[PDB]
Amino acid sequence: YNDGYDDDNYDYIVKNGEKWMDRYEIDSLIGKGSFGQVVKAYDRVEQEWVAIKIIKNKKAFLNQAQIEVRLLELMNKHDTEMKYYIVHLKRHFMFRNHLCLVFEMLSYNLYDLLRNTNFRGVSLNLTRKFAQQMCTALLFLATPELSIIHCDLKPENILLCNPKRSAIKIVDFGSSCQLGQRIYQYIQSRFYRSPEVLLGMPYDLAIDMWSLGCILVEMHTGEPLFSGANEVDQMNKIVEVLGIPPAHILDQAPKARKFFEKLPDGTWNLKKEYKPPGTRKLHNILGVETGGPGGRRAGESGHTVADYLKFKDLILRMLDYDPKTRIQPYYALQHSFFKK
Ligand SMILES: COc1ccc(-c2cc(N)nc(N)n2)cc1
């Protein structure tokens, strides 16, 4: 494979210490994915640490990373401070038959941050900082010129700028697309997958807002809100919390009958284990009246019952079954949860 530079996964065989075009010193492998690999590297010329995404030597992944480059460069054009919520692509190059995207060095992802809490979660105040940033990021992506659906929002794709501050950025637009297809694809990571995508329905930018609602509850509680072992398990766990989706959704939904039954009266219920629909209140998951998740926030700053009530309101508005009425980023940012 490739004058010996590639393994049988078409990945570049990374050597710690290697120097590239007399410029970059590869320090280590920090990241792996379907796309290929990510390495930490020192740019001798600019005197800075960088993350290089090394794409696989296969034409599908090369073509997809070309779409990623296009989108990142489109975003970088914009003369707004909102584009600083998206990881900066400095430049790209072909090297030993691999496309390489050079990024700014960021820090840990939000999954690492949860592992650092031993999966008991971060304060409501830190959740709020992350939420403001993520809603701004989504307000940016929903700019008409852009209309980018990220399509894979989850803790693992949201990184800290540095381990000392609360600043974050979204990475990995490899699964992204611009709005103007309205077709079904098996997309989003299962825990963060919108009901429209579960139901085989066409999707728009609202799916990133679904994923964000799920992420913010998990940041605070320490655990995924909806941890499905499969699509049926996933929908069933959503229905435990949010109850039966509206009939006007299910009537139009190609995969409605994978999870639901239409009854003779034209109402729907779960098909043929689980708590009855809507019995797992977000009110209780958040511990609104009981000192927050598992009572662990009992008498703490900015953990009042009213604070939890505003958070709950915002989350339930992000977890709307109906993509038409699901809160849009502008309005999310005007929510009283952010009046601190
Ligand atoms: C810590 O620095 C990093 C680590 C990873 C990335 C990154 C960017 C990107 N577009 N796609 C993926 N998969 N990863 C950027 C900076």
Swiss-Prot record:
Q: Which residues form the Protein kinase domain?
A: 24-338
Using the record's annotations, give every residue carrying the modification Phosphothreonine. 267
Write out the PTM section of this UniProt entry.
Answer: Autophosphorylated on numerous tyrosine residues. Can also autophosphorylate on serine and threonine residues (in vitro).
Residues of the signal sequence?
A: none
Q: Where does ATP bind?
A: 30-38, 53, 103-106
Q: In which tissues is it expressed?
A: Ubiquitous. Highest levels in skeletal muscle, testis, fetal lung and fetal kidney.
Effect in UniProt of substituting residue 53 to R? Abolished protein kinase activity
Residue stretches spanning the membrane: none
Residues bearing Phosphotyrosine are: 5, 10, 24, 42, 84, 184, 186, 308
The active site annotation covers 152
Q: Report residue spans for region: Disordered.
A: 273-301
Phosphoserine sites (modified residues):
175
> What the protein does?
Dual-specificity kinase which possesses both serine/threonine and tyrosine kinase activities. Plays an important role in double-strand breaks (DSBs) repair following DNA damage. Mechanistically, phosphorylates RNF169 and increases its ability to block accumulation of TP53BP1 at the DSB sites thereby promoting homologous recombination repair (HRR).
By sequence similarity, the record places it as follows:
Belongs to the protein kinase superfamily. CMGC Ser/Thr protein kinase family. MNB/DYRK subfamily.
Q: How does it assemble?
A: Interacts with RAD54L2/ARIP4. Interacts with CRY2. Interacts with RANBP9. Interacts with WDR68. Interacts with SIRT1.
Domain remarks in the Swiss-Prot or TrEMBL record: The polyhistidine repeats act as targeting signals to nuclear speckles. The histidine-rich domain (HRD) region is intrinsically disordered and promotes the formation of phase-separated liquid droplets that enhance its ability to phosphorylate the CTD (C-terminal domain) of the large subunit of RNA polymerase II (RNA Pol II).
Identify the disorder associated with this protein. Answer: Intellectual developmental disorder, autosomal dominant 7: A disease characterized by primary microcephaly, severe intellectual disability without speech, anxious autistic behavior, and dysmorphic features, including bitemporal narrowing, deep-set eyes, large simple ears, and a pointed nasal tip. Intellectual disability is characterized by significantly below average general intellectual functioning associated with impairments in adaptive behavior and manifested during the developmental period.
List the protein's name.
Dual specificity tyrosine-phosphorylation-regulated kinase 1A
Q: Which organism is it from?
A: Homo sapiens (Human)
Boundaries of the shown chain within the full protein: 136 to 481 of 763
